[PDB]
Amino acid sequence: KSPIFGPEEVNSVEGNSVSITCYYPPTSVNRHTRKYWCRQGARGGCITLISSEGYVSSKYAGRANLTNFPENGTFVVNIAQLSQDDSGRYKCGLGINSRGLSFDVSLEVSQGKVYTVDLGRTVTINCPFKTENAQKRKSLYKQIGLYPVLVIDSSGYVNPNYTGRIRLDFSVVINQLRLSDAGQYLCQASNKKNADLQVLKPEPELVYEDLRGSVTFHCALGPEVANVAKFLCRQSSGENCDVVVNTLGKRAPAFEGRILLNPQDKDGSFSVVITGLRKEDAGRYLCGAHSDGQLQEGSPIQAWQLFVNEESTIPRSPTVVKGVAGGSVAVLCPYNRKESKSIKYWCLWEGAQNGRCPLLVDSEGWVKAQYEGRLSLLEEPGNGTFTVILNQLTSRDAGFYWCLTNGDTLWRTTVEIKIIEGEPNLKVPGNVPCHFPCKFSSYEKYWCKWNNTGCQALPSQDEGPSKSRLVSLTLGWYWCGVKQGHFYGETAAVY
């Protein structure tokens, strides 16, 4: 369908300006075509209300603006002087109206002591007191059925509905409010005075990401709730948070290896990283600490509306590169051609929830304990990718590996290494044996002297298939591997 993404549903009060941002896949055509904001008329197609090419309608004359941000890949339509008439179904898109490439935005304008807080957040209500009497008999009162049906006992006992979260003094403070808790409570002190309580579900922070890419969520919840365990939903049709990742330890089965969770900062703001996004990742992701993990009411939450573009510039990456135990592999990791590398970090996964990646190698050349020697990263194929290798086929190495870079567009492409025991394609350990099958020998079996800084080729048996390869250093860690030239085939570990 259309790769255009915007607010599925805006809303506002009359006389208040609204800003609607629509995301489109950044390409030259998309950056230079017409950007249109039309209104789906009841019978008849769009009547174009505003366009990027200087057009504005009968209305939206001096009320509206349409700015195009090609670099961001977006366009923002601003509508001022909103009215009850300006409510209905609109479309924001590119090119021709009768053409598809668009997104549907449902705009609704609502007619224009109050305390408005998010669900599961602190709030307090004031109730004026007559000072002529020292303390008249007062309690809390609720607006349900024309008469405050007992909501707080005058003795101080908490109602079953408002249990264990209310304190009374005239100030009453209640925290962890659910959606149904708020109401225009009429409190008396009998001196009756009005009040208002409002709960608003936080608006989702739209995130438009690409297929075969990575996304990051920043759950900056209030510090207070900070220490309570946090989680990350994925909101379905009916209210059921298919919990994806949890601070407590819960993990989603179809998200293994990939997802990494940053530890909580000083406050309570941790980031969740997802990689290898697919078309089924499109949906509302809801944060929320509330120890249990399941998104249950009365908890501070933060929302995101991820949209995965199905027309992505990220090229295909081989998802799995399984190999022979004692042999070697080759992992070609794509990166942004525009911005060249800074640090080619290469990682592992601890789990499906924690998953703190362990930079096996870096552009400097620092290597981990078990991969000290038996692992390398070799820039070329320079044109916007590279090739990290890992010889000497240990089993334990099975898992998922991330091709990190500290450039800009941070795709953290993931690759699965399925190791299988079998015949090794090249020969053994030196002192200097080496062997690769004749079918695999169409290339040029080579030797390198292993350096964590840079692989440098050195002389060995440089002939035809000889038993097939071999290594000679007639007069450390060394590599005896096949090379395609541009790209590279497997390795060989000699001492």
Partner: protein, 116 residues
């Protein structure tokens, strides 16, 4: 369809499954009269992997590819001492599929538009 496109030949397959005595015997009759055993080849019965006493057998009869487009029939007769009256006939034709109905709908409008 794949092989039909080749426009070289057509392969039809009797596939007989569940016969326990395994002395089954397929035979092809086309144009009401039996075809010579040269055209059709019948495999030996083999045990049903998904069960026990039931077996299975093929019989693939090859034919001119345009004969199949001709519009023939090619019946096949599994005769085996277990079917009710000892013979079972099956027939395949170019139109043996359940009827397909079209739904062409030509929009000659210049308004009503498409959907990406």
């Amino acid at each position: 369809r794949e092989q039909l496109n080749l426009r070289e030949s057509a392969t039809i397959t009797c596939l007989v499954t569940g016969f326990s005595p395994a002395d089954v015997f397929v035979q092809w009759m086309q144009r009401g009269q039996p075809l010579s055993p040269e055209k059709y080849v019948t495999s030996a019965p083999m045990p049903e992997p998904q069960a026990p006493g039931r077996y299975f057998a093929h019989s693939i009869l090859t034919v001119s590819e345009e004969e199949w487009n001709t519009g023939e029939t090619y019946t096949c007769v599994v005769a085996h001492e277990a079917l009710p009256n000892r013979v079972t006939e099956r027939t395949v034709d170019k139109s043996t599929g359940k009827p397909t109905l079209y739904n062409v709908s030509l929009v000659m409008s210049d308004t009503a538009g498409t959907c990406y």
